[PDB]
Design a protein around this ligand. Sequence first.
Ligand code: LK2
Length: 433
Amino acid sequence: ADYQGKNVVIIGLGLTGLSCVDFFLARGVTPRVMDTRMTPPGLDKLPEAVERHTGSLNDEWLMAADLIVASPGIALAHPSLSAAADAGIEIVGDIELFCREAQAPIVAITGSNGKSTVTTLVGEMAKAAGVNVGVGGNIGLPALMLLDDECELYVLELSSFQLETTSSLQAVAATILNVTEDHMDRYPFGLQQYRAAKLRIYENAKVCVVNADDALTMPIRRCVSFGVNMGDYHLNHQETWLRVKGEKVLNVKEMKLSGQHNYTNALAALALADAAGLPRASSLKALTTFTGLPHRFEVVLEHNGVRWINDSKATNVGSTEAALNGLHVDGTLHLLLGGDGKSADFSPLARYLNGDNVRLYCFGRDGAQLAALRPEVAEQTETMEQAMRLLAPRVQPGDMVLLSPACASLDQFKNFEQRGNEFARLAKELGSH
Ligand SMILES: CCCCOc1ccc2cc(S(=O)(=O)N[C@H](CCC(=O)O)C(=O)O)ccc2c1
């Protein structure tokens, strides 16, 4: 694509908004930037020659634009964007701009849970094969920061929000790992509308990879499948093995990751890597070396008979359910829940919270709603720190402390990483004498 002479408006700063700014400048186009936040991240990094408008949208700028580059963090349904669309003004996001330029095949991964794990895994499979790979998108570096004509493969995590503004993706391999309720604050037509956004990832994909166990991951109108008991890629319990069409490929005792949902993450990653043409041996090797992502069921302290686990990356109900389903606790589970629940129904969690060995410590915007899952075993505080200091004295040898909050952190924190980092610091303070 050619942007010379166009009036370009970018909505949303941050590293992504900045990567869009840098993208245009390097192409001889000075964009203008707006953000609904008064002091958006990276404002101080924004070059002085770039005009900016913060604290609201600017309809004069939007309606004058030839191209609007919209952060995934702003709804296309926002009246100002709806007005621009009605006017025939083209709206894209960073992923769209990237796809128009990329000169290597793209593996594209979305889903409500497991997408960063599968993304990072496919990256490691490529690295083990000696492929120059760029890994990022919705995690790590924004996609435009990966663009390099020496890159031989791109592996992108894409959110439902990014997908809504992307039209030119033709993935070599694409998957929706699963679809469970999330982002309902952005999808007023409910679960099918959210699903529709993710289904975009399959458009013009060379191979589609679906979850045999989740019908919502399948196109409305074959794909390769992965699953637990069925699928082209499936599990065999003997010990557990990864299998491809009846052939054993890996005894999961060689994996550092554990738990059934990580075994299906492994299958999804292998299916994508196979479709991308990566050698099978090096892909299997990566499965054995990968240790996990920070904030993803991460043991931050195991001391004095107590495991403290940072699962701050659990920003939705289905992710917290993945941590709880099949969870082994010797003594009492001390579960930290809270933040901005994005209008989620938390009741699917209730079935894991029965018995004499669970306590709930509920905080942030939706703390009262979370406490209400089982009031008799729940405490509510304003902050996660308060919750930690409340629970710490009650922790006994055999117990587990688990931050798996089922909510976005954005009511009280910059992001789930800062929430995880704060938890870890507090765990280390409170978990020794
Ligand atoms: C003009 C836009 C101003 C707001 O900027 C944003 C950019 C990206 C965004 C991405 C998302 S998001 O939904 O993709 N990610 C959050 C992350 C939660 C957490 O880290 O605790 C979530 O899954 O709930 C939400 C809001 C966003 C807002």
